[PDB]
Enzyme design. Structure first.
Site, PDB file in Angstrom:
ATOM      1  N   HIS A  61      29.650 -31.059 -18.124  1.00 53.44           N
ATOM      2  CA  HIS A  61      28.814 -30.258 -17.231  1.00 53.44           C
ATOM      3  C   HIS A  61      29.180 -28.783 -17.247  1.00 53.44           C
ATOM      4  O   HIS A  61      28.308 -27.945 -17.005  1.00 53.44           O
ATOM      5  CB  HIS A  61      28.937 -30.736 -15.776  1.00 53.44           C
ATOM      6  CG  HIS A  61      28.713 -32.209 -15.595  1.00 53.44           C
ATOM      7  ND1 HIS A  61      27.472 -32.798 -15.720  1.00 53.44           N
ATOM      8  CD2 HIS A  61      29.571 -33.202 -15.268  1.00 53.44           C
ATOM      9  CE1 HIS A  61      27.579 -34.096 -15.491  1.00 53.44           C
ATOM     10  NE2 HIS A  61      28.842 -34.369 -15.218  1.00 53.44           N
ATOM     11  N   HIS A  91      35.796 -22.510 -13.228  1.00 55.36           N
ATOM     12  CA  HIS A  91      34.763 -22.823 -14.196  1.00 55.36           C
ATOM     13  C   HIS A  91      33.636 -21.815 -14.021  1.00 55.36           C
ATOM     14  O   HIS A  91      33.650 -20.982 -13.104  1.00 55.36           O
ATOM     15  CB  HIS A  91      34.224 -24.242 -14.008  1.00 55.36           C
ATOM     16  CG  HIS A  91      33.605 -24.449 -12.663  1.00 55.36           C
ATOM     17  ND1 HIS A  91      34.326 -24.858 -11.563  1.00 55.36           N
ATOM     18  CD2 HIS A  91      32.332 -24.262 -12.235  1.00 55.36           C
ATOM     19  CE1 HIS A  91      33.520 -24.903 -10.511  1.00 55.36           C
ATOM     20  NE2 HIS A  91      32.305 -24.550 -10.896  1.00 55.36           N
ATOM     21  N   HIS A  93      29.098 -21.267 -14.493  1.00 55.63           N
ATOM     22  CA  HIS A  93      27.740 -21.695 -14.765  1.00 55.63           C
ATOM     23  C   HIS A  93      27.003 -20.563 -15.471  1.00 55.63           C
ATOM     24  O   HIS A  93      27.181 -19.380 -15.117  1.00 55.63           O
ATOM     25  CB  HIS A  93      27.033 -22.049 -13.447  1.00 55.63           C
ATOM     26  CG  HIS A  93      27.791 -23.013 -12.570  1.00 55.63           C
ATOM     27  ND1 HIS A  93      27.508 -24.365 -12.523  1.00 55.63           N
ATOM     28  CD2 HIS A  93      28.821 -22.818 -11.703  1.00 55.63           C
ATOM     29  CE1 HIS A  93      28.318 -24.955 -11.659  1.00 55.63           C
ATOM     30  NE2 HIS A  93      29.134 -24.046 -11.154  1.00 55.63           N
ATOM     31  N   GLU A 103      24.162 -19.243  -9.954  1.00 56.16           N
ATOM     32  CA  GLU A 103      23.704 -20.167  -8.917  1.00 56.16           C
ATOM     33  C   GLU A 103      23.274 -19.427  -7.652  1.00 56.16           C
ATOM     34  O   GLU A 103      22.120 -19.535  -7.227  1.00 56.16           O
ATOM     35  CB  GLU A 103      24.818 -21.166  -8.648  1.00 56.16           C
ATOM     36  CG  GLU A 103      25.202 -21.976  -9.926  1.00 56.16           C
ATOM     37  CD  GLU A 103      25.770 -23.344  -9.627  1.00 56.16           C
ATOM     38  OE1 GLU A 103      26.836 -23.428  -8.978  1.00 56.16           O
ATOM     39  OE2 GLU A 103      25.139 -24.344 -10.045  1.00 56.16           O
ATOM     40  N   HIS A 116      33.370 -19.626 -10.640  1.00 54.95           N
ATOM     41  CA  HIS A 116      33.834 -20.315  -9.432  1.00 54.95           C
ATOM     42  C   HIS A 116      35.324 -20.601  -9.539  1.00 54.95           C
ATOM     43  O   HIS A 116      35.754 -21.381 -10.400  1.00 54.95           O
ATOM     44  CB  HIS A 116      33.049 -21.613  -9.219  1.00 54.95           C
ATOM     45  CG  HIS A 116      31.618 -21.380  -8.848  1.00 54.95           C
ATOM     46  ND1 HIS A 116      30.616 -22.316  -9.029  1.00 54.95           N
ATOM     47  CD2 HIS A 116      31.013 -20.273  -8.349  1.00 54.95           C
ATOM     48  CE1 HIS A 116      29.473 -21.809  -8.610  1.00 54.95           C
ATOM     49  NE2 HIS A 116      29.681 -20.574  -8.197  1.00 54.95           N
ATOM     50  N   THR A 195      28.118 -27.423  -5.555  1.00 59.97           N
ATOM     51  CA  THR A 195      26.793 -27.224  -6.152  1.00 59.97           C
ATOM     52  C   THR A 195      26.459 -28.236  -7.243  1.00 59.97           C
ATOM     53  O   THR A 195      25.401 -28.105  -7.881  1.00 59.97           O
ATOM     54  CB  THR A 195      26.657 -25.827  -6.769  1.00 59.97           C
ATOM     55  OG1 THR A 195      27.569 -25.751  -7.869  1.00 59.97           O
ATOM     56  CG2 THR A 195      26.932 -24.703  -5.771  1.00 59.97           C
ATOM     57  N   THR A 196      27.337 -29.208  -7.505  1.00 57.56           N
ATOM     58  CA  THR A 196      27.053 -30.372  -8.334  1.00 57.56           C
ATOM     59  C   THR A 196      27.295 -31.627  -7.515  1.00 57.56           C
ATOM     60  O   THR A 196      28.030 -31.594  -6.515  1.00 57.56           O
ATOM     61  CB  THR A 196      27.942 -30.428  -9.592  1.00 57.56           C
ATOM     62  OG1 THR A 196      29.292 -30.809  -9.243  1.00 57.56           O
ATOM     63  CG2 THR A 196      27.959 -29.086 -10.292  1.00 57.56           C
TER      64      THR A 196
HETATM   65  N1  LIG Z   1      37.345 -38.322  -2.810  1.00 57.16           N
HETATM   66  C1  LIG Z   1      36.408 -37.832  -3.772  1.00 57.16           C
HETATM   67  N2  LIG Z   1      35.187 -38.191  -3.607  1.00 57.16           N
HETATM   68  C2  LIG Z   1      34.270 -37.780  -4.423  1.00 57.16           C
HETATM   69  N3  LIG Z   1      34.515 -37.046  -5.418  1.00 57.16           N
HETATM   70  C3  LIG Z   1      35.766 -36.641  -5.635  1.00 57.16           C
HETATM   71  C4  LIG Z   1      36.763 -37.019  -4.836  1.00 57.16           C
HETATM   72  N4  LIG Z   1      37.885 -36.486  -5.376  1.00 57.16           N
HETATM   73  C5  LIG Z   1      37.536 -35.790  -6.415  1.00 57.16           C
HETATM   74  N5  LIG Z   1      36.277 -35.904  -6.543  1.00 57.16           N
HETATM   75  C6  LIG Z   1      35.433 -35.404  -7.503  1.00 57.16           C
HETATM   76  C7  LIG Z   1      34.764 -34.272  -6.799  1.00 57.16           C
HETATM   77  O1  LIG Z   1      34.303 -34.340  -5.758  1.00 57.16           O
HETATM   78  N6  LIG Z   1      34.885 -33.159  -7.585  1.00 57.16           N
HETATM   79  C8  LIG Z   1      34.287 -31.960  -7.142  1.00 57.16           C
HETATM   80  C9  LIG Z   1      34.301 -31.037  -8.320  1.00 57.16           C
HETATM   81  C10 LIG Z   1      33.561 -29.741  -8.052  1.00 57.16           C
HETATM   82  C11 LIG Z   1      32.220 -29.687  -8.215  1.00 57.16           C
HETATM   83  C12 LIG Z   1      31.597 -28.511  -7.999  1.00 57.16           C
HETATM   84  C13 LIG Z   1      32.302 -27.427  -7.626  1.00 57.16           C
HETATM   85  S1  LIG Z   1      31.379 -25.868  -7.363  1.00 57.16           S
HETATM   86  N7  LIG Z   1      30.162 -25.852  -8.473  1.00 57.16           N
HETATM   87  O2  LIG Z   1      30.794 -26.023  -6.165  1.00 57.16           O
HETATM   88  O3  LIG Z   1      32.233 -24.905  -7.396  1.00 57.16           O
HETATM   89  C14 LIG Z   1      33.639 -27.481  -7.484  1.00 57.16           C
HETATM   90  C15 LIG Z   1      34.282 -28.664  -7.697  1.00 57.16           C
HETATM   91 ZN   LIG Z   2      30.670 -24.225  -9.798  1.00 49.84          ZN
END
Ligand SMILES: Nc1ncnc2c1ncn2CC(=O)NCCc1ccc(S(N)(=O)=O)cc1
Ligand SMILES: [Zn+2]
EC number: 4.2.1.1
Length: 257
Positions: A61, A91, A93, A103, A116, A195-196
């Site tokens: 992603h 990371h 986008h 975003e 981010h 945001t994902t």
């Molecule tokens: N207990 C739990 N339950 C569910 N998932 C869990 C979890 N532990 C870890 N994970 C995976 C998760 O959530 N990862 C999030 C990763 C992420 C996405 C987007 C942004 S961003 N684009 O917003 O910066 C920043 C970080």
């Molecule tokens: Zn992000």
């Protein structure tokens, strides 16, 4: 599985992640004339001098540069935040064209990409606990525009060849994320979400007003990455951004006038 294509992209996410239609989703458009200056906000404290980067990963992603977050080594404090937030990864986008990719938007303007820097609140013990809390995460967002090269980004750009496809990782030690910051730490802030997927409503968003500039060559190398794994049909990793979501019952605050 979710993605950014026509058949698995942002308009589909709500079917597996109903919080996609929730009360504090991200990103949002930042309307500069209606954000309110808040003189109670404190200055941001970005303390990255002891940062310990470990690894860079293509996760299908985006790509993540991961940090040692088992001690207070690279932390974000101050601003709207109570307590200490540890840097776990950053990371980006980005777009297929220079006119899109961010975003967040500013007065509906889209930037070429968005960085981010993801941090979690140490009072919750580990990142997995933190994402279950309304004040669990603080994400520092930085816009990228195309122009002059960003020297502090080139080390990242030069390793992307080694993580072209989903699931590839590479050693990435001794990287200094201070090389990715703009001069000013003026910011907007609001409560939002990842945001994902899983789109959890656990993030205090801190979006810097000043974009950084990167070169055409730098962003072009982002666009040579692959969403797919090795030996699968090649799909270029571009336009991995979620569009702006409704602000609903939220006010964006500014640290500056
Ligand atoms: N207990 C739990 N339950 C569910 N998932 C869990 C979890 N532990 C870890 N994970 C995976 C998760 O959530 N990862 C999030 C990763 C992420 C996405 C987007 C942004 S961003 N684009 O917003 O910066 C920043 C970080
Ligand atoms: Zn992000």
């Amino acid at each position: 599985h979710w993605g950014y294509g026509k058949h698995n992209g942002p308009e589909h996410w709500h079917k597996d992640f109903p919080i996609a239609k929730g009360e504090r989703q991200s990103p949002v458009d930042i309307d500069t004339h209606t954000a309110k200056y808040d003189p109670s906000l404190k200055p941001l404290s970005v303390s990255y001098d002891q940062a310990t980067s470990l690894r860079i990963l293509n996760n299908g992603h985006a790509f993540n540069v991961e940090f040692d977050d088992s001690q207070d080594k690279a932390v974000l404090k101050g601003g709207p935040l109570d307590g200490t937030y540890r840097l776990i990864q950053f990371h980006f986008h980005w777009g297929s064209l220079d006119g899109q990719g961010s975003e967040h938007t500013v007065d509906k303007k889209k930037y070429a990409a968005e960085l981010h820097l993801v941090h979690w609140n140490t009072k919750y013990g580990d990142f997995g606990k933190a994402v279950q809390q309304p004040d669990g995460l603080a994400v520092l967002g930085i816009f990228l525009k195309v122009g002059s090269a960003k020297p502090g980004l080139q080390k990242v750009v030069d390793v992307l060849d080694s993580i072209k496809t989903k699931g590839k990782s590479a050693d990435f030690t001794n990287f200094d994320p201070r090389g990715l910051l703009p001069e000013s730490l003026d910011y907007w802030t609001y409560p939002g979400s990842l945001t994902t997927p899983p789109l959890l409503e656990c993030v205090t968003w801190i979006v810097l007003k000043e974009p950084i500039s990167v070169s055409s060559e730098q962003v072009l190398k982002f666009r040579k990455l692959n969403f797919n794994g090795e030996g699968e049909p090649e799909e270029l990793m571009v336009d991995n951004w979620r569009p702006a979501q409704p602000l609903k019952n939220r006010q964006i605050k500014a640290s500056f006038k």
